[PDB]
C-alpha cells in the first residue's frame, strides 16, 4: 500500500493520465512529487525490491497507464529505474520492474545510453543471473541501437569492457557486427585496441564481418591494433586480409 503522501500524488497523477485526452505535463505539481518519492524508493544503491514491489502493487491498482508512466519515469540525467537497477547490479529490482511487462528498454539517458547498453557495459562475468536479466534486455529491445552522442552500441560497450560472454549473447541475439560510430569505428576495431584475441577471433568468425572498413581518418582494425602494439592481433587481422 502506498504511503499517504504518495498516494495521493499518484491518484491527482492517475486523475490527470485518465481523463479523455490524457494530457499530463511531466513537469506538474502531482508528476514531480511521484517522481521525487519513486527515484527515492526505486533507484538508490540501497533501495530493496521487497519496498519497490509494495510501491508497484500500489501504482498497479489504480491503473495501467499510470502503471506504465511510472515504471518508466526518467530523471533529470534521462534515468529510468532499471537504468540504475541495471547499472547497480540490483537484479532483484531488474526482474522486478522487467516483470511488469511494461518497460521501454531502448529509451536513452541524457549520456545516450538505453538499459540494454548499461547492461552490456556492466556485465558481471560471474554472474548467471545477470546474464538472465542482459538476455530479458535484448529479447524487449534493439540490440543494435546506437547511443544518442557516441554511436556506439551494445556490442562496442561490451567489448571496450572486455565483457566477452556479453559479447558472445549479443550476437546471438543478432548484433551487427559492421555497425560504426559516431567517429565511424566498428566493433572490430574496438576488439582490435582492446587486444583480447578471442574476442577479435570471434568476430572475425562472424559470417559477413568486414576487415576493410574504415573510420572518419581512414583508419582500420589492422592499423588501430599496430599502433596499440597489439601484435598478435594485427598478425590475425593479416591473415584475414
Avoid at 94 to 119: F, W
Avoid at 189 to 218: F, H, K, W
Amino acid at each position: 500500500e502506498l504511503n499517504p503522501r504518495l498516494r495521493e500524488a499518484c491518484i491527482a497523477l492517475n486523475q490527470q493520465l485518465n481523463r479523455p485526452r490524457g494530457v499530463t505535463s511531466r513537469d506538474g505539481n502531482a508528476a514531480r512529487l511521484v517522481a521525487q518519492e519513486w527515484f527515492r524508493v526505486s533507484s538508490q544503491k540501497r533501495s530493496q525490491a521487497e519496498s519497490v514491489a509494495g510501491v508497484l502493487r500500489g501504482v498497479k491498482s489504480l491503473g495501467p497507464e499510470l502503471l506504465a508512466y511510472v515504471v518508466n519515469l526518467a530523471d533529470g540525467n534521462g534515468n529510468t529505474a532499471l537504468h540504475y537497477s541495471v547499472s547497480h547490479g540490483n537484479l532483484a529490482i531488474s526482474s522486478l520492474l522487467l516483470d511488469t511487462g511494461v518497460c521501454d528498454v531502448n529509451h536513452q539517458n541524457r549520456a545516450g545510453y538505453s538499459a540494454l547498453m548499461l547492461a552490456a557495459l556492466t556485465s558481471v562475468g560471474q554472474e548467471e543471473e545477470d546474464m538472465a536479466v542482459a538476455q530479458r534486455l535484448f529479447s524487449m529491445g534493439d540490440v543494435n541501437a546506437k547511443a544518442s552522442q557516441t554511436g556506439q552500441t551494445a556490442l562496442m560497450l561490451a567489448i571496450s569492457h572486455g565483457h566477452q560472454d556479453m559479447v558472445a549473447a549479443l550476437l546471438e541475439c543478432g548484433a551487427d557486427v559492421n555497425v560504426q560510430d559516431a567517429d565511424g569505428a566498428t566493433a572490430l576495431m574496438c576488439a582490435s585496441e582492446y587486444g583480447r584475441l578471442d574476442t577479435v577471433q570471434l568476430l572475425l568468425a562472424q559470417p559477413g564481418c568486414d576487415l576493410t572498413i574504415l573510420d572518419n581518418e581512414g583508419t582500420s582494425a589492422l592499423a588501430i591494433a599496430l599502433e596499440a602494439e597489439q601484435d598478435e592481433v594485427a598478425a590475425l587481422l593479416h591473415a584475414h586480409l
